[PDB]
Design a protein around this ligand. Sequence first.
Ligand SMILES: Nc1nc2c(ncn2[C@@H]2O[C@H](COP(=O)(O)OP(=O)(O)OP(=O)(O)O)[C@@H](O)[C@H]2O)c(=O)[nH]1
Ligand SMILES: [Mg+2]
Lengths: 132, 13, 165, 415
Amino acid sequence: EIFELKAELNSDKKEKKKEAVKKVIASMTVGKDVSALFPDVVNCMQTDNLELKKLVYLYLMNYAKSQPDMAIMAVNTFVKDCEDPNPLIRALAVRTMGCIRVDKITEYLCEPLRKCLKDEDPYVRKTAAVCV
Amino acid sequence: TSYDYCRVPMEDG
Amino acid sequence: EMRILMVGLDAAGKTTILYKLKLGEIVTTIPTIGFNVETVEYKNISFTVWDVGGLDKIRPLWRHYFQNTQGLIFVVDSNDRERVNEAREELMRMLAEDELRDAVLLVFANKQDLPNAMNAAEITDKLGLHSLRHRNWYIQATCATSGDGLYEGLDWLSNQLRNQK
Amino acid sequence: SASAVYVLDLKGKVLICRNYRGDVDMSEVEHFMPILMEKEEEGMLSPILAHGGVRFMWIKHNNLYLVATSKKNACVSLVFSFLYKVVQVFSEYFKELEEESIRDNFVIIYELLDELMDFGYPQTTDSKILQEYITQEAPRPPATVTNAVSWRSEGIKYRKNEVFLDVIEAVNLLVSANGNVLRSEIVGSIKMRVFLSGMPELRLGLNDKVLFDNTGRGKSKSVELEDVKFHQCVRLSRFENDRTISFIPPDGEFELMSYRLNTHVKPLIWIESVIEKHSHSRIEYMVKAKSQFKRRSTANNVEIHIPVPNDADSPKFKTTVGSVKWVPENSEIVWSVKSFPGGKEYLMRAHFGLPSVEAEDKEGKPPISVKFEIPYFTTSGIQVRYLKIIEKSGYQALPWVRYITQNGDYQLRTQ
Ligand SMILES: Nc1nc2c(ncn2[C@@H]2O[C@H](COP(=O)(O)OP(=O)(O)OP(=O)(O)O)[C@@H](O)[C@H]2O)c(=O)[nH]1
Ligand SMILES: [Mg+2]
């Protein structure tokens, strides 16, 4: 059930962890407490896909008040994806950084936000302005 | 749209 | 198709040699508050590497990879004698588990550019690697700024992953 | 300043939820539907509900209650315009909007509510540009999402160059039962269908009264646009100076301008209805429909809805031209006429029974409300005069137009 979901979520092929995280945010849609599977979807975050990072960022966005001490395992990934040459993934990282309301996290996140308020492509600046 | 159109002029300066 | 970690106390140059194996540069990197995961394709066995930093708020957050976990690398910080003691206590906390059992140990002697650094024998005798039952361990001297000794330790690691020709 | 855009459905279960601020709890949506049932079962219904200190702004689509909570002094016009733009974005991706699209497209609807709004502040909602980095089938976001021209991706190429207009009138009417006309206003909507190549600069020129007065032609046929509401694309400062309508068009269908003028001329279709309602016995409808408009244009498919009593039975329909169906789902006789020429007068006489034992509750008196559609016939007299295609590339485009009059709420109050 959720254990076989975690087994698919600890795989090596992309087309099982992708269906895993889509199944996770379909379980979140119908109103399930899938909060216990938090630090195992975040292993399936640092992906070459961008159609998948939106879903993982969404899961982080909903389930950080309920897993607040667990949520410190995304900060390096936010400051890692706030360097990428694609402006869409930078602005996605910036509008994800602000939505996580965890008081152990926002202290660390002022440096890439300072980097992105002066960034070039004005999609990420119009994101970072509201992220302030 | 079953009906038909009518051409309007371009310049009319 | 075998996975591997990089844990240990922070400021050990472990993300340094991680992106040295990944890219081949000396990368500029902040202290890794969360984690890092990429992969390395070499010797036809994918070395998927999982760095986790060594801050005190993320020391209890190492167990969350230990489900479906096949390898282990402990990256020492030999240039801090006042922190290698708590690194050893962290290591004996980590190797006191019943869930990490097939994962062989792999010690990397990292940051080998200072003359204060020890050899591959004094660090072993201090950390007590001979007294580790059911643990296939091997220490390896790796210099981060050059990149020497990395792939030889990975070759021993690939001898530990598969057991064939 | 929205807090959490939900999507409810007709029962109170959340098809999709997406909070932007975290200043409203996620289990506040379960308090919505009992509050709406409580406020509707005492007649104090409003779009702004109140659960303590959390306000529920909501619109009601087909199956959907697009509730979007807030907590502060929320900008309500912003929230409601954002809700109808969410409805328009979903209906431009998903050609209907029901529960069968929200539970199938959660791959893309969470990405849309990720994209449209940040922190409560709507930021990118033009769907024809939004189809270029949020797809159900990602690259860099376009320079259209950056630049001032934020509704037109550059480099669109067609082989032909066609600009289709639609100066669609809509006569409103509300005739009181004494026989006089109360509110007879006309709401036109020039609704374009653009197919051009590049970044053109059109200059639409109407026969606007202020333009013909500033020119000096204030004695010919000039429509008096009382209020004009343009699209975003029309540069409004140049319109405010000297009544020039210059705009860089989008690609596809949109509503360019939505004018509104009053009219003190006769109604187009006039419905002289009488009612012989004997109590407990029967009812009769000697309704005649005289077409006041010109002899040349033909009112296609008029449907003079006429409200019958709720419990009438066993009807008879002596008409002159056009079929009558009695529709009892709505309690009305939809007297349809297919071709209804101007100047004629077609008479209908319905005849029902009525139940002998009386009803339990009163019913109210809905209006006779016709559904006419007169093509090639603008009531207000607006004439499009030109449409200057200006393009740096330089080509001869083919503008087009057609004229339709419809109904707005063409109601007529009854006996
Ligand atoms: N002189 C010298 N310094 C090194 C060498 N390798 C690593 N360092 C230092 O080690 C520090 C650690 O770098 P990082 O890899 O980014 O940090 P880390 O080792 O991953 O530790 P955390 O990420 O904080 O958990 C750097 O600031 C370097 O200054 C080396 O070969 N020579
Ligand atoms: Mg690091």
